[PDB]
Write a protein that binds this DNA or RNA. Structure first.
Ligand SMILES: [Ca+2]
Ligand code: NA
Length: 276
DNA sequence: TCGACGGATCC
DNA sequence: GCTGATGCGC
DNA sequence: GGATCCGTCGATCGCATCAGC
């Protein structure tokens, strides 16, 4: 069936108002996305922090439209070392961060422009574009090394500040997070190993799955539909884009959204509301 | 994702 | 700047 | 021996590279 994301809850479980709006979006071609009216949608959503994944754009080519962006003044980018046109992430934020790191501290997993870390006063925000297992699972064993090292790094991080992980994690955690689960159990993003990986990330750091925590039996809620076969029109998609929260910040959670109606990519954007 | 391909197995 | 062909994607 | 029932197996749209001139 189709999905209607419920209205935005901007008060916390204790009725404190939301102070902080993090929107995250796998833009699948920053340049294509900007041309497809993507930045207009960002201006009207008006986040405090915008996280972008799969920018597929070097720093040189970064379109002009982004310098204009004024509520998202501080702007951080990471693209791979030697593979041009591939992967890439960004982190734009209204307020200026205390510190910005690139990578997870592992030479092996830091060559593809996938993670930005941003320390704010109350918490630390990691935004990640996780590597796909590949068509035919050619990268699936790399993905298991990634998942284990990314888990270790994130456990280390969250032991020092509360942690918001956002972005495209390239796995549908459970059979509710995708429309055709039994047909994809051998495909990238729903192998037992990717799903086992996610659950270990949830129990190890630990982190609660922001959206599922609030809506644990809502189905047909997805972040990505393939461009092929009119899949988005039939809403035949996957939940790939999460906010993963330290349990500590669960009482700061106001709401976690899926912006199904925002076009511009093969992922819709998700949005987090915190009282901080 | 969706279909055409088989090659199976059931009335 | 163009064509045409590859890489990479859930 | 017709008709359904199964898991493999293509090409599916999109973005951005690249080789070459
Ligand atoms: Ca490839
Ligand atoms: Na006969």
């Amino acid at each position: 069936a189709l999905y209607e994301d419920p209205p935005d809850q901007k008060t916390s479980p204790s009725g404190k108002p939301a102070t902080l709006k993090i929107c995250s979006w796998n833009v699948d071609g920053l340049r294509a996305w900007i041309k497809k009216k993507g930045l207009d949608w960002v201006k009207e959503e008006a986040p405090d922090i915008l996280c972008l994944q799969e920018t597929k754009c070097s720093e040189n080519k970064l379109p002009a439209e982004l310098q204009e962006l004024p509520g998202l003044s501080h702007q951080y980018w990471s693209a791979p070392s030697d593979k041009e046109g591939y992967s890439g992430v960004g982190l734009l934020s209204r307020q200026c961060p205390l510190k910005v790191s690139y990578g997870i501290g592992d030479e092996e997993h830091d060559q593809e422009g996938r993670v930005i870390v941003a320390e704010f006063d109350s918490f630390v925000l990691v935004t990640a574009y996780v590597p796909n297992a590949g068509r035919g699972l050619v990268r699936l064993e790399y993905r298991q090394r990634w998942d284990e090292a990314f888990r270790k790094f994130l456990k280390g991080l969250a032991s020092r500040k509360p942690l918001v992980l956002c972005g495209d994690l390239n796995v549908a955690h459970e059979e509710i997070d995708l429309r055709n689960p039994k047909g994809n159990k051998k495909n990238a993003g729903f192998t037992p190993q990717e799903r086992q990986g996610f659950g270990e990330l949830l129990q190890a750091v630990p982190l609660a799955d922001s959206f599922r925590h609030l809506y644990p039996n809502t189905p047909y809620a997805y972040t990505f539909w393939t461009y092929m076969m009119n899949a988005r029109s039939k809403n035949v998609g996957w939940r790939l884009d999460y906010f993963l929260l330290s349990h500590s910040l669960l009482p700061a959670l106001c709401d976690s959204k899926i912006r199904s109606k925002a076009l511009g990519s093969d992922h819709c954007p998700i949005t987090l509301y915190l009282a901080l």
